[PDB]
């Protein structure tokens, strides 16, 4: 609305500056953005309060940035905070008061809660509201009557239409409450599972659980925790908390195996009580209460096998007290989201290390699952030592002239290969590998295109890993890498970042990436976040290097791809050249070698 002679939005006509603004560490913008002095004496209280009421945008070292959202406001009401309570404390923290536009915005979002609640009973879904009249106006659109099946008033809703109705309810300004009173529920039988005292719960984990379990009723939503932060333990703890039949869904069979191990590792539950409903393996799922499977299995669009149909019908008919969803960034997919309509679950908890995707469907998680129940501050976890200090870097590999000549000439998809394969990027990786290998550092090499992966790994005489590599060959390489001292690096394709349980490594070199996507970048970095046998956070023991070809599309993709990491606070140090690479003996030391590779690169046709 108001803009100065400069592009900055100004709010002098919108809010005043309080008398003790120097003591107050926060500002409230009329557009919903919020800033917080991380160095302020009350930062601790303000951080908790802003994580409770707002959505974090950036959390750098000196000033954090947040924005208000209906979902974040609903979460605030979900922990019992009244409009006056958040307003009074926000005004007290705000050094420039609260703009009336935000105050009235908060009013609407606060009063629009508690009015309508969705609950399921006897495999039937009922929409309840305390006020009886609200239903009459809320039903004024036939989409609800067609969705509706043919005090505390309620009506039953057609299961298949719940997704459409729930999304409408948001833009209809009447969100559905999803608190599940697992404590006062005798209809769904409890399960004999508890967290064994061997399990250790960290403060951030405890915070996320406390925020999810704001009362005796579990709240649905998404918890964002790094893979190294023990997201699996939180999920297992939530199941142990709900004490009712629960369904865990992983994005891969490897994850399903990981979950089984974690459940046995952290809970009193026995192996027979856990089943891994999977096409590749059978555990007689109907024989036990805890089930584990994948979106590909349940979400399967084609004809089901007769045996798998037996379990699925049993799964369909049973009601799940808790539905744990891992790597929910995939959930908004057209097929994966169908799982939410197929399975009947009282409360659904989503977990993921990278709640980002290149499509505008991430926001669906707010209605498909719920608001962000928690989102760890990765810098705080490093400061607390829970995550390894990773000195990220971007090596600006200069492209070779004969490569650039072709790269600039070829505008088709073939340039992705040419910018991925050049002597300088190759020599740089070989040099960094040799250096870290002679430094006795475990190194993981990452790539996308198999052609470059092969030609690099073969020229480096190192074992690569990719899709068609059988599980036996694949794991045998990991065991050698982990244990054999003579091997210290592995060349992994997307298989390593998509979904896997790779052994932790001190160093990671990414020579190729699918694009400027944030998701894959943070998934790759996640592999090195694991704490080592004797490291310390100030040691800067972990490393992460992105190899990019200067003056190429890789530069655009790389900067675009790092957005999520810089938002979390990571410093991508640019490396123009590495001292010693001029004298170290490396491949492509003569133009004929470059020409030979370039010729074969062109032969790719």
């Amino acid at each position: 609305t108001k803009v100065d002679e400069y592009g900055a939005k100004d709010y002098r006509l919108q809010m005043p500056l309080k008398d003790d603004h120097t003591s107050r560490p926060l500002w409230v913008a009329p557009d919903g953005h919020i800033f917080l002095e991380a160095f302020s004496p009350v930062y601790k209280y303000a951080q908790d309060f802003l994580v409770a009421i707002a959505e974090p945008v950036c959390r750098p070292t000196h000033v954090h940035e947040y924005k208000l959202t209906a979902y974040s406001l609903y979460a605030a009401v979900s922990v019992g905070l009244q409009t006056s309570d958040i307003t009074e404390y926000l005004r007290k923290l705000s050094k420039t008061g609260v703009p009336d536009g935000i105050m009235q915005f908060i009013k609407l979002c606060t009063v629009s809660y508690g009015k309508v609640k969705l609950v399921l009973k006897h495999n039937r879904y009922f929409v309840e509201s305390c006020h009886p009249d609200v239903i009459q106006h809320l039903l004024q659109d036939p989409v609800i009557r067609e969705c509706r099946l043919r005090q505390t008033v309620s009506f039953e809703v057609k299961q298949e239409m719940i997704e459409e109705l729930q999304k409408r309810c948001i833009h209809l300004e009447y969100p559905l409450l999803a608190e599940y009173d697992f404590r006062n529920d005798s209809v769904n039988p409890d399960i004999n599972i508890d967290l064994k005292p061997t399990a250790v719960l960290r403060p951030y984990q405890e915070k996320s659980l406390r925020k999810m379990f704001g009362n005796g009723r579990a709240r649905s939503g998404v918890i964002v925790l790094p893979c190294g932060a023990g997201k699996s333990l939180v999920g297992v703890t939530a199941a142990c908390t709900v004490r009712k039949r629960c369904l865990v869904l992983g994005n891969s069979a490897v994850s399903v195996e990981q979950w089984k191990a974690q459940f046995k590792m952290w809970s009193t539950i026995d192996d027979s009580q856990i089943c891994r409903f999977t096409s590749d393996a059978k555990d007689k799922p109907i024989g036990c209460s805890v089930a584990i499977s994948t979106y590909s299995m349940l979400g399967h669009t084609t004809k089901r096998s007769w045996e798998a149909e037996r379990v699925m019908e049993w799964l369909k008919t049973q009601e799940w007290g808790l539905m744990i969803l891992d790597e929910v960034h995939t959930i908004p997919a057209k097929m994966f989201r169908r799982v939410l309509t197929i399975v009947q679950a009282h409360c659904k908890l989503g977990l993921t290390a990278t709640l980002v995707r290149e499509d505008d469907k991430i926001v669906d998680l707010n209605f498909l699952i719920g608001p962000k129940l928690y989102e760890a501050n990765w810098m705080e976890l490093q400061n607390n030592g829970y995550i390894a200090k990773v000195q990220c870097a971007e090596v600006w590999c200069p492209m070779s002239p004969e490569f650039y000549r072709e790269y600039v000439a070829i505008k088709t998809k073939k340039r992705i290969l040419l910018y991925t394969m050049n002597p300088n990027k190759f020599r740089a990786c070989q040099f960094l590998i040799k250096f870290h290998e002679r430094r006795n550092d475990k190194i993981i090499v990452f790539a996308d295109n198999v052609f470059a992966l092969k030609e690099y790994a073969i020229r480096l005489n190192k074992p690569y890993i990719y899709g068609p590599t059988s599980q036996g060959e694949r794991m045998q390489i990991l065991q050698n890498f982990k244990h054999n001292p003579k091997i210290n690096t592995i060349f992994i394709s997307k298989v390593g970042d998509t979904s896997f349980d790779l052994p932790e490594a001190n160093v990671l070199i990414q020579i190729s990436s699918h694009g400027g996507s944030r998701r894959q970048e943070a998934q790759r970095l996640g592999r090195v976040l694991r704490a080592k046998k004797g490291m310390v956070a100030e040691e800067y023991n972990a490393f992460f290097y992105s190899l990019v070809s200067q003056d190429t599309q890789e530069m655009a993709y790389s900067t675009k791809r790092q957005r999520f990491l810089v938002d979390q606070g990571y410093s991508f140090k640019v490396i123009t050249k590495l001292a010693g690479m001029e004298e170290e003996d490396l491949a492509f030391s003569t133009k004929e070698e470059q020409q030979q590779l370039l010729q074969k690169v062109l032969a790719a046709t």
Partner: protein, 69 residues
């Protein structure tokens, strides 16, 4: 013989792009007088402005458009 113009020196990647520009006739004119060296070429003084503009454009073609994102 002797030739009027302007010399430009840059890394050989840009030097290849410069050779590519007139080889592809992107600017329609053989602005390179001669191949001086892997990092050096001599060019007509009147075209250096659009040449510099094309180099600037090439960076944007190979750089992310931050634009308050």
């Amino acid at each position: 013989n002797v030739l009027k113009g302007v010399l430009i020196e840059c890394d050989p990647a840009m030097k290849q792009f410069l050779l590519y520009l007139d080889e592809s006739n992107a600017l329609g004119k053989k602005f390179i007088i001669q191949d001086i060296d892997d990092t050096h070429v001599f060019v007509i003084a009147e075209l250096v402005n659009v040449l510099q503009e094309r180099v600037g454009e090439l960076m944007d073609q190979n750089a992310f458009s931050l634009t308050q994102k």
